[PDB]
Amino acid sequence: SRKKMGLLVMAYGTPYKEEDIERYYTHIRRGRKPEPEMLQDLKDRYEAIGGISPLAQITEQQAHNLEQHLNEIQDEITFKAYIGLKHIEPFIEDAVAEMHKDGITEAVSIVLAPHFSTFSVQSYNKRAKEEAEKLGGLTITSVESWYDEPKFVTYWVDRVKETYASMPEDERENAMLIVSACSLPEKIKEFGDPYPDQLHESAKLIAEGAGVSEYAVGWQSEGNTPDPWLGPDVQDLTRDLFEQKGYQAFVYVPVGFVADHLEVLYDNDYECKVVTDDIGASYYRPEMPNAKPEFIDALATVVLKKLGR
């Protein structure tokens, strides 16, 4: 009695083992293979954050718990998850072709990044649909943004509340909340990309929910191209904020990310930590959503809402 639907879960992608780093970054660098020194630096970074293998496992866990959870909370549809990545197989095109081969005719997609952007989400979505259209007999409704889903906001609000609650009294009264997302070229402003505004909206929502009056918006993990990227970078923001008001503790909420990947374990837990340690403030960075039940339910709701259910 259930209708069969494909669940297309897309993400940036992560290497599966150390030997994948080269091709992973070459693909990210659009064909430019990292020099030996960079390659070694990269390996060291991954090793320092606890190894690579756990990383890719997270996306897989998220896709499968989501699939099982959606299949459990409603009884009209039976979902089958398919992972489509941007920088490593299984690629988006691959995930779609396989859905087509398994007989899927109807699908719903969602990108494992809460804020819409012309650079990523729109691109992932456009590519998934074009492949489908190329194969035929398969349609896809795509979620474009979900940073505003209440369950998702509540997840970060409560993690923030716990973090501040755990702080000493003097730290609780002199802390700064830095909410961030992956940086992108400023040029996206040319198309009226709402990415920046959406991140600011995420920050306002989480801070308001958590009762935090002092907070700021920053960006991190930008790439390296001649064209200016969205700023300020979380590193400069932290030091700048400290130099002007002397906060004793910084709370980092990389709302743009959904799992324990390199951008959070290193770019936050290491790079921002270097700065807070340097200035003498306390470093705090709440648990990322990953595959926790609360997160999965929020995503399930996002998908069901998209389908009018």
mmCIF file of C-alpha atoms in Angstrom:
data_model
loop_
_atom_site.group_PDB
_atom_site.id
_atom_site.type_symbol
_atom_site.label_atom_id
_atom_site.label_comp_id
_atom_site.label_asym_id
_atom_site.label_seq_id
_atom_site.Cartn_x
_atom_site.Cartn_y
_atom_site.Cartn_z
ATOM 1 C CA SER A 1 0.000 0.000 0.000
ATOM 2 C CA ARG A 2 3.050 2.257 0.411
ATOM 3 C CA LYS A 3 4.410 4.464 -2.361
ATOM 4 C CA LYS A 4 8.107 3.866 -3.098
ATOM 5 C CA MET A 5 10.228 7.016 -3.156
ATOM 6 C CA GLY A 6 13.924 7.650 -3.445
ATOM 7 C CA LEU A 7 15.645 9.800 -0.815
ATOM 8 C CA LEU A 8 18.543 11.648 -2.426
ATOM 9 C CA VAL A 9 20.967 12.756 0.269
ATOM 10 C CA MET A 10 23.707 15.014 -1.077
ATOM 11 C CA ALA A 11 26.841 16.387 0.542
ATOM 12 C CA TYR A 12 30.305 17.779 -0.124
ATOM 13 C CA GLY A 13 31.935 14.400 0.415
ATOM 14 C CA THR A 14 34.984 13.231 2.363
ATOM 15 C CA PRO A 15 37.878 10.885 1.670
ATOM 16 C CA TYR A 16 37.440 7.284 2.858
ATOM 17 C CA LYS A 17 41.120 6.702 3.536
ATOM 18 C CA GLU A 18 44.426 8.553 3.527
ATOM 19 C CA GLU A 19 45.149 7.405 -0.020
ATOM 20 C CA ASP A 20 42.092 9.344 -1.277
ATOM 21 C CA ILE A 21 43.235 12.794 -0.088
ATOM 22 C CA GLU A 22 45.158 13.478 -3.317
ATOM 23 C CA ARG A 23 42.258 12.895 -5.720
ATOM 24 C CA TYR A 24 39.767 14.422 -3.282
ATOM 25 C CA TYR A 25 41.579 17.761 -3.171
ATOM 26 C CA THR A 26 42.542 17.654 -6.835
ATOM 27 C CA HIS A 27 38.836 17.480 -7.553
ATOM 28 C CA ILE A 28 38.167 20.340 -5.140
ATOM 29 C CA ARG A 29 40.985 22.329 -6.719
ATOM 30 C CA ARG A 30 39.382 21.780 -10.109
ATOM 31 C CA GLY A 31 42.130 19.645 -11.596
ATOM 32 C CA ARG A 32 45.106 21.197 -9.831
ATOM 33 C CA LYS A 33 46.884 18.418 -7.936
ATOM 34 C CA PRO A 34 48.182 19.625 -4.544
ATOM 35 C CA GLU A 35 51.966 19.957 -4.319
ATOM 36 C CA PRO A 36 53.836 17.358 -2.220
ATOM 37 C CA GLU A 37 54.199 19.673 0.790
ATOM 38 C CA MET A 38 50.488 20.461 0.855
ATOM 39 C CA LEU A 39 49.647 16.793 0.446
ATOM 40 C CA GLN A 40 51.755 16.018 3.518
ATOM 41 C CA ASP A 41 50.252 18.919 5.483
ATOM 42 C CA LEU A 42 46.772 17.601 4.664
ATOM 43 C CA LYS A 43 47.615 14.068 5.816
ATOM 44 C CA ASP A 44 48.967 15.476 9.084
ATOM 45 C CA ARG A 45 45.799 17.507 9.642
ATOM 46 C CA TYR A 46 43.518 14.516 9.240
ATOM 47 C CA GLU A 47 45.712 12.420 11.537
ATOM 48 C CA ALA A 48 45.627 15.180 14.142
ATOM 49 C CA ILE A 49 41.823 15.267 14.221
ATOM 50 C CA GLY A 50 41.599 11.540 14.940
ATOM 51 C CA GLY A 51 41.830 9.882 11.543
ATOM 52 C CA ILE A 52 39.840 9.895 8.324
ATOM 53 C CA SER A 53 37.638 6.768 8.348
ATOM 54 C CA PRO A 54 35.137 8.103 10.938
ATOM 55 C CA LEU A 55 34.396 11.127 8.733
ATOM 56 C CA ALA A 56 32.739 9.467 5.722
ATOM 57 C CA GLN A 57 30.935 7.101 8.070
ATOM 58 C CA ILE A 58 28.930 10.022 9.476
ATOM 59 C CA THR A 59 27.213 10.952 6.199
ATOM 60 C CA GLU A 60 26.311 7.311 5.675
ATOM 61 C CA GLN A 61 24.884 7.100 9.184
ATOM 62 C CA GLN A 62 22.880 10.274 8.605
ATOM 63 C CA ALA A 63 21.418 8.992 5.344
ATOM 64 C CA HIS A 64 20.438 5.629 6.825
ATOM 65 C CA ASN A 65 19.008 6.790 10.148
ATOM 66 C CA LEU A 66 17.015 9.367 8.197
ATOM 67 C CA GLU A 67 15.693 6.663 5.875
ATOM 68 C CA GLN A 68 14.669 4.376 8.721
ATOM 69 C CA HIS A 69 13.246 7.208 10.784
ATOM 70 C CA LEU A 70 11.094 8.621 7.982
ATOM 71 C CA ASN A 71 9.824 5.089 7.261
ATOM 72 C CA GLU A 72 8.878 4.761 10.913
ATOM 73 C CA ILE A 73 7.030 8.052 11.588
ATOM 74 C CA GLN A 74 4.565 7.943 8.683
ATOM 75 C CA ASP A 75 2.961 5.003 6.900
ATOM 76 C CA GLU A 76 2.207 6.328 3.418
ATOM 77 C CA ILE A 77 5.686 6.286 1.936
ATOM 78 C CA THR A 78 8.584 3.844 1.989
ATOM 79 C CA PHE A 79 11.868 5.717 1.462
ATOM 80 C CA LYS A 80 15.118 4.290 0.051
ATOM 81 C CA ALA A 81 18.216 6.415 0.697
ATOM 82 C CA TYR A 82 20.852 7.190 -1.937
ATOM 83 C CA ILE A 83 23.998 9.222 -1.284
ATOM 84 C CA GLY A 84 25.241 11.659 -3.917
ATOM 85 C CA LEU A 85 28.493 13.491 -3.244
ATOM 86 C CA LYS A 86 30.193 16.446 -4.915
ATOM 87 C CA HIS A 87 33.907 15.677 -4.596
ATOM 88 C CA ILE A 88 34.153 11.881 -4.400
ATOM 89 C CA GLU A 89 32.158 8.812 -5.421
ATOM 90 C CA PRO A 90 29.388 8.021 -5.164
ATOM 91 C CA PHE A 91 28.844 11.200 -7.184
ATOM 92 C CA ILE A 92 25.484 12.914 -7.557
ATOM 93 C CA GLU A 93 25.105 11.653 -11.132
ATOM 94 C CA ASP A 94 25.880 8.121 -9.905
ATOM 95 C CA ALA A 95 23.286 8.225 -7.117
ATOM 96 C CA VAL A 96 20.635 9.330 -9.616
ATOM 97 C CA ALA A 97 21.483 6.717 -12.249
ATOM 98 C CA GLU A 98 21.308 4.007 -9.600
ATOM 99 C CA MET A 99 17.906 5.206 -8.388
ATOM 100 C CA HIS A 100 16.792 5.009 -11.994
ATOM 101 C CA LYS A 101 18.169 1.486 -12.259
ATOM 102 C CA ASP A 102 16.490 0.332 -9.042
ATOM 103 C CA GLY A 103 13.207 1.396 -10.577
ATOM 104 C CA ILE A 104 12.736 4.603 -8.590
ATOM 105 C CA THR A 105 10.466 6.991 -10.489
ATOM 106 C CA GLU A 106 9.798 9.596 -7.812
ATOM 107 C CA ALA A 107 12.297 11.171 -5.415
ATOM 108 C CA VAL A 108 12.907 13.891 -2.837
ATOM 109 C CA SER A 109 16.377 15.362 -2.324
ATOM 110 C CA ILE A 110 17.982 17.295 0.504
ATOM 111 C CA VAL A 111 21.484 18.702 0.842
ATOM 112 C CA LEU A 112 23.359 18.161 4.103
ATOM 113 C CA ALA A 113 23.921 21.902 4.483
ATOM 114 C CA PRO A 114 21.094 24.063 5.988
ATOM 115 C CA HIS A 115 21.600 27.287 3.977
ATOM 116 C CA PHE A 116 20.849 27.724 0.289
ATOM 117 C CA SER A 117 23.523 29.079 -2.034
ATOM 118 C CA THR A 118 23.905 29.320 -5.819
ATOM 119 C CA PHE A 119 27.395 27.888 -5.499
ATOM 120 C CA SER A 120 26.529 24.637 -3.744
ATOM 121 C CA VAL A 121 22.903 23.695 -3.073
ATOM 122 C CA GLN A 122 21.509 25.103 -6.333
ATOM 123 C CA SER A 123 24.337 23.428 -8.224
ATOM 124 C CA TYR A 124 23.862 20.050 -6.508
ATOM 125 C CA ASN A 125 20.117 20.289 -7.147
ATOM 126 C CA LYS A 126 20.493 21.334 -10.790
ATOM 127 C CA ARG A 127 22.934 18.475 -11.464
ATOM 128 C CA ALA A 128 20.670 15.869 -9.870
ATOM 129 C CA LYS A 129 17.695 16.979 -11.957
ATOM 130 C CA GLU A 130 19.632 17.178 -15.234
ATOM 131 C CA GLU A 131 20.862 13.615 -14.804
ATOM 132 C CA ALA A 132 17.298 12.538 -14.087
ATOM 133 C CA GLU A 133 15.983 14.408 -17.126
ATOM 134 C CA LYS A 134 18.739 12.796 -19.185
ATOM 135 C CA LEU A 135 17.656 9.329 -18.033
ATOM 136 C CA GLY A 136 13.940 10.077 -18.049
ATOM 137 C CA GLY A 137 11.065 8.459 -16.187
ATOM 138 C CA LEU A 138 12.346 9.995 -12.958
ATOM 139 C CA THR A 139 11.469 13.245 -11.207
ATOM 140 C CA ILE A 140 12.937 14.944 -8.158
ATOM 141 C CA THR A 141 11.583 17.583 -5.787
ATOM 142 C CA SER A 142 14.509 19.312 -4.093
ATOM 143 C CA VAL A 143 14.763 20.931 -0.692
ATOM 144 C CA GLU A 144 16.652 24.209 -1.158
ATOM 145 C CA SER A 145 17.131 25.402 2.429
ATOM 146 C CA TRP A 146 16.051 24.276 5.898
ATOM 147 C CA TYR A 147 18.100 26.391 8.314
ATOM 148 C CA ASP A 148 14.793 27.783 9.530
ATOM 149 C CA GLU A 149 13.190 24.447 10.501
ATOM 150 C CA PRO A 150 12.210 24.877 14.201
ATOM 151 C CA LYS A 151 13.534 21.460 15.183
ATOM 152 C CA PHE A 152 16.888 22.362 13.684
ATOM 153 C CA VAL A 153 16.994 25.731 15.457
ATOM 154 C CA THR A 154 15.972 24.084 18.734
ATOM 155 C CA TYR A 155 18.870 21.626 18.388
ATOM 156 C CA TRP A 156 21.424 24.440 18.345
ATOM 157 C CA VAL A 157 19.587 26.579 20.861
ATOM 158 C CA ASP A 158 19.642 23.816 23.488
ATOM 159 C CA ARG A 159 23.289 22.904 22.790
ATOM 160 C CA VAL A 160 24.141 26.590 23.246
ATOM 161 C CA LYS A 161 22.067 26.815 26.443
ATOM 162 C CA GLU A 162 23.925 23.845 27.924
ATOM 163 C CA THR A 163 27.263 25.328 26.939
ATOM 164 C CA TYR A 164 26.566 28.659 28.637
ATOM 165 C CA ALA A 165 25.037 26.863 31.619
ATOM 166 C CA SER A 166 28.294 24.940 32.072
ATOM 167 C CA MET A 167 30.350 28.149 32.108
ATOM 168 C CA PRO A 168 31.751 29.781 35.257
ATOM 169 C CA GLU A 169 29.799 32.850 36.357
ATOM 170 C CA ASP A 170 32.451 35.314 35.171
ATOM 171 C CA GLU A 171 32.690 33.517 31.831
ATOM 172 C CA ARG A 172 28.904 33.316 31.475
ATOM 173 C CA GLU A 173 28.774 37.108 31.789
ATOM 174 C CA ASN A 174 31.611 37.890 29.397
ATOM 175 C CA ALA A 175 31.280 35.430 26.516
ATOM 176 C CA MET A 176 30.809 35.888 22.769
ATOM 177 C CA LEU A 177 28.821 33.621 20.471
ATOM 178 C CA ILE A 178 30.321 33.229 17.017
ATOM 179 C CA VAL A 179 27.986 31.570 14.513
ATOM 180 C CA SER A 180 29.537 30.571 11.199
ATOM 181 C CA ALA A 181 29.284 28.728 7.870
ATOM 182 C CA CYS A 182 31.640 27.886 4.985
ATOM 183 C CA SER A 183 32.914 31.030 3.238
ATOM 184 C CA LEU A 184 32.165 31.559 -0.472
ATOM 185 C CA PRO A 185 33.315 34.029 -3.136
ATOM 186 C CA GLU A 186 31.663 37.423 -2.635
ATOM 187 C CA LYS A 187 30.730 37.406 -6.326
ATOM 188 C CA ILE A 188 27.633 35.320 -5.512
ATOM 189 C CA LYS A 189 26.157 38.668 -4.422
ATOM 190 C CA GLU A 190 25.846 39.344 -8.169
ATOM 191 C CA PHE A 191 22.973 36.854 -8.411
ATOM 192 C CA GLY A 192 21.329 38.035 -5.207
ATOM 193 C CA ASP A 193 22.431 34.836 -3.415
ATOM 194 C CA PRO A 194 20.674 34.732 -0.001
ATOM 195 C CA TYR A 195 23.434 32.596 1.575
ATOM 196 C CA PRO A 196 24.866 35.459 3.684
ATOM 197 C CA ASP A 197 21.449 36.642 4.846
ATOM 198 C CA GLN A 198 20.422 33.074 5.683
ATOM 199 C CA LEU A 199 23.478 32.616 7.884
ATOM 200 C CA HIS A 200 22.690 35.875 9.681
ATOM 201 C CA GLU A 201 19.105 34.677 10.105
ATOM 202 C CA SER A 202 20.403 31.397 11.580
ATOM 203 C CA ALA A 203 22.555 33.351 14.026
ATOM 204 C CA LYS A 204 19.714 35.629 15.117
ATOM 205 C CA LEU A 205 17.366 32.665 15.584
ATOM 206 C CA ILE A 206 19.788 30.597 17.643
ATOM 207 C CA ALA A 207 20.959 33.492 19.832
ATOM 208 C CA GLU A 208 17.391 34.678 20.463
ATOM 209 C CA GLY A 209 16.330 31.154 21.336
ATOM 210 C CA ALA A 210 19.261 30.648 23.690
ATOM 211 C CA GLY A 211 18.849 33.996 25.439
ATOM 212 C CA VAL A 212 22.295 35.091 24.219
ATOM 213 C CA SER A 213 22.387 38.847 23.597
ATOM 214 C CA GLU A 214 26.033 39.053 22.475
ATOM 215 C CA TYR A 215 26.907 37.221 19.265
ATOM 216 C CA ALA A 216 28.498 37.732 15.857
ATOM 217 C CA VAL A 217 28.484 36.195 12.406
ATOM 218 C CA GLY A 218 31.668 34.922 10.834
ATOM 219 C CA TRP A 219 32.848 32.688 8.013
ATOM 220 C CA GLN A 220 35.538 30.038 7.836
ATOM 221 C CA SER A 221 37.362 27.518 5.681
ATOM 222 C CA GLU A 222 37.477 29.758 2.608
ATOM 223 C CA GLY A 223 39.226 28.535 -0.521
ATOM 224 C CA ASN A 224 42.180 30.179 -2.251
ATOM 225 C CA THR A 225 41.288 32.156 -5.381
ATOM 226 C CA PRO A 226 42.253 35.719 -6.351
ATOM 227 C CA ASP A 227 38.640 36.858 -5.934
ATOM 228 C CA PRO A 228 37.530 38.012 -2.438
ATOM 229 C CA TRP A 229 35.605 35.539 -0.284
ATOM 230 C CA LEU A 230 32.878 36.306 2.263
ATOM 231 C CA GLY A 231 34.315 37.574 5.524
ATOM 232 C CA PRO A 232 35.351 38.177 8.155
ATOM 233 C CA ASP A 233 37.028 34.838 8.801
ATOM 234 C CA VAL A 234 36.270 33.442 12.276
ATOM 235 C CA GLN A 235 39.950 33.773 13.240
ATOM 236 C CA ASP A 236 40.166 37.524 12.644
ATOM 237 C CA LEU A 237 36.672 38.061 14.026
ATOM 238 C CA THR A 238 37.629 36.401 17.310
ATOM 239 C CA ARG A 239 40.804 38.412 17.765
ATOM 240 C CA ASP A 240 39.059 41.580 16.619
ATOM 241 C CA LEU A 241 36.150 41.115 19.034
ATOM 242 C CA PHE A 242 38.573 40.353 21.864
ATOM 243 C CA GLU A 243 40.773 43.383 21.183
ATOM 244 C CA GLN A 244 37.731 45.638 21.318
ATOM 245 C CA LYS A 245 35.785 44.231 24.293
ATOM 246 C CA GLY A 246 37.921 41.517 25.902
ATOM 247 C CA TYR A 247 35.505 38.555 25.967
ATOM 248 C CA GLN A 248 36.678 35.734 28.284
ATOM 249 C CA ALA A 249 35.065 32.883 26.377
ATOM 250 C CA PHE A 250 34.063 32.242 22.784
ATOM 251 C CA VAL A 251 31.357 29.791 21.789
ATOM 252 C CA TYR A 252 31.616 28.550 18.219
ATOM 253 C CA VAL A 253 28.516 27.274 16.459
ATOM 254 C CA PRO A 254 29.477 26.278 12.881
ATOM 255 C CA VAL A 255 25.776 26.093 11.995
ATOM 256 C CA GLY A 256 26.651 25.734 8.310
ATOM 257 C CA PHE A 257 28.105 22.250 8.938
ATOM 258 C CA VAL A 258 26.243 19.121 10.084
ATOM 259 C CA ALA A 259 29.028 16.716 11.038
ATOM 260 C CA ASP A 260 32.436 16.236 12.669
ATOM 261 C CA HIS A 261 34.505 16.926 9.536
ATOM 262 C CA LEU A 262 37.838 18.662 8.919
ATOM 263 C CA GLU A 263 36.254 22.127 8.759
ATOM 264 C CA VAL A 264 35.079 21.824 12.351
ATOM 265 C CA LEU A 265 37.636 19.525 13.985
ATOM 266 C CA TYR A 266 40.525 21.527 12.543
ATOM 267 C CA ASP A 267 39.301 24.918 11.334
ATOM 268 C CA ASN A 268 37.425 25.443 14.599
ATOM 269 C CA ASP A 269 38.767 23.062 17.239
ATOM 270 C CA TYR A 270 42.353 23.799 16.199
ATOM 271 C CA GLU A 271 42.551 27.171 14.407
ATOM 272 C CA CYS A 272 40.043 29.097 16.546
ATOM 273 C CA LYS A 273 41.443 27.299 19.609
ATOM 274 C CA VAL A 274 44.912 28.589 18.700
ATOM 275 C CA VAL A 275 43.534 32.122 18.828
ATOM 276 C CA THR A 276 41.452 31.799 22.017
ATOM 277 C CA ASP A 277 44.452 30.149 23.696
ATOM 278 C CA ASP A 278 46.668 32.981 22.457
ATOM 279 C CA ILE A 279 44.366 35.638 23.868
ATOM 280 C CA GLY A 280 43.679 33.645 27.028
ATOM 281 C CA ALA A 281 39.948 33.107 26.561
ATOM 282 C CA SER A 282 38.029 29.833 26.938
ATOM 283 C CA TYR A 283 37.156 27.812 23.847
ATOM 284 C CA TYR A 284 33.745 26.142 23.529
ATOM 285 C CA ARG A 285 32.294 24.416 20.462
ATOM 286 C CA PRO A 286 28.988 22.481 20.985
ATOM 287 C CA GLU A 287 28.368 18.979 19.678
ATOM 288 C CA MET A 288 27.713 18.891 15.926
ATOM 289 C CA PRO A 289 24.382 17.345 14.836
ATOM 290 C CA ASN A 290 25.933 14.281 13.169
ATOM 291 C CA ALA A 291 23.459 11.389 13.292
ATOM 292 C CA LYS A 292 21.833 12.078 16.667
ATOM 293 C CA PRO A 293 18.088 11.264 16.961
ATOM 294 C CA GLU A 294 17.129 14.910 17.484
ATOM 295 C CA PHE A 295 18.882 15.927 14.272
ATOM 296 C CA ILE A 296 17.414 13.059 12.263
ATOM 297 C CA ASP A 297 13.889 14.006 13.372
ATOM 298 C CA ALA A 298 14.446 17.618 12.290
ATOM 299 C CA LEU A 299 15.598 16.427 8.854
ATOM 300 C CA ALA A 300 12.688 13.992 8.642
ATOM 301 C CA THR A 301 10.299 16.884 9.254
ATOM 302 C CA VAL A 302 12.074 18.954 6.612
ATOM 303 C CA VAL A 303 11.518 16.231 4.027
ATOM 304 C CA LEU A 304 7.904 15.581 5.010
ATOM 305 C CA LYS A 305 7.092 19.289 4.957
ATOM 306 C CA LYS A 306 8.566 19.515 1.460
ATOM 307 C CA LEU A 307 6.117 16.799 0.375
ATOM 308 C CA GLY A 308 3.093 18.425 1.987
ATOM 309 C CA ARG A 309 2.973 15.700 4.629
#
